[PDB]
Amino acid sequence: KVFGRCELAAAMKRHGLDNYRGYSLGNWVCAAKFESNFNTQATNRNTDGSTDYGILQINSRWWCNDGRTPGSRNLCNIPCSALLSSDITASVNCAKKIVSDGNGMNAWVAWRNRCKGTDVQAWIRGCR
Ligand SMILES: [Cl-]
Ligand SMILES: [Cl-]
Numbered sequence: 001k002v003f004g005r006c007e008l009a010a011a012m013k014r015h016g017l018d019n020y021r022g023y024s025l026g027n028w029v030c031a032a033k034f035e036s037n038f039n040t041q042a043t044n045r046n047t048d049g050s051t052d053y054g055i056l057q058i059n060s061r062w063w064c065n066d067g068r069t070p071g072s073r074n075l076c077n078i079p080c081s082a083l084l085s086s087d088i089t090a091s092v093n094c095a096k097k098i099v100s101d102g103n104g105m106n107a108w109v110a111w112r113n114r115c116k117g118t119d120v121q122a123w124i125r126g127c128r
Contacts, residue, residue: 001086003038003055005029006127008088015092021099026120027111028095032056033123034110040091041084054083054091056108063094 003011009029012018018025035057036042044052050061050069060069064080076094083091098107105111 001040003032003040005033005038005123008032008038008055009124009127011088012092015089017092017095020096021104023099023105024120026123027105027115029123030115030118030120031105031108031111034114035108040086040088043084051080053080054085055088056091056095057110058083058091058094058098063098 009025012028013025017023017028032038032055035052036055038055040055042054042057044057046052046059048061050059050072051066052059053064053066058064058076058080060066060072060080062073063076064078064083065072065074066080076090076097078090078094083094085091099105101107105116
C-alpha cells in the first residue's frame with residue numbers, strides 16, 4: 001500500500017500517534033515520507049546486515065524478527081513481514097515502543113536529517 005499523505009495522517013491519528021511522547025502528528029507523517037515514501041511494502045538493507053521494514057522502516061537488529069539478522073532481538077515480538085501490511089497497526093504499536101526507548105524520534109535517521117527542526121506541520125496542512 002502506497003498511502004496518500006492525508007490518508008496516512010488520518011490512520012496515524014486514529015492509532016493515537018498525534019502528540020505521542022510529545023511528537024505532533026506532522027513529525028510522524030514527515031518521518032514516514034522520508035523513511036518509506038509512504039509505502040507499507042518498503043524494505044532496505046542496512047550496512048550492518050539488518051534490514052528496515054515498512055512505513056516507518058523499523059529495524060531487524062532490535063525490533064522485529066526476519067531470521068537473518070544475527071544478534072537480532074525482537075523487542076516488538078513480531079515477524080518483520082507483519083510490518084509490511086496495508087494495515088499499519090503493528091508498525092504503529094512497534095513505533096510507540098521505539099520512541100519511548102530513550103532518544104525519542106532521533107531513532108529514525110530520516111526524521112533527524114529531514115524533519116527535525118523543519119516546519120513538520122506542513123505535512124498535515126490541507127488534511128481534514
Ligand atoms: Cl504537526
Ligand atoms: Cl523525546
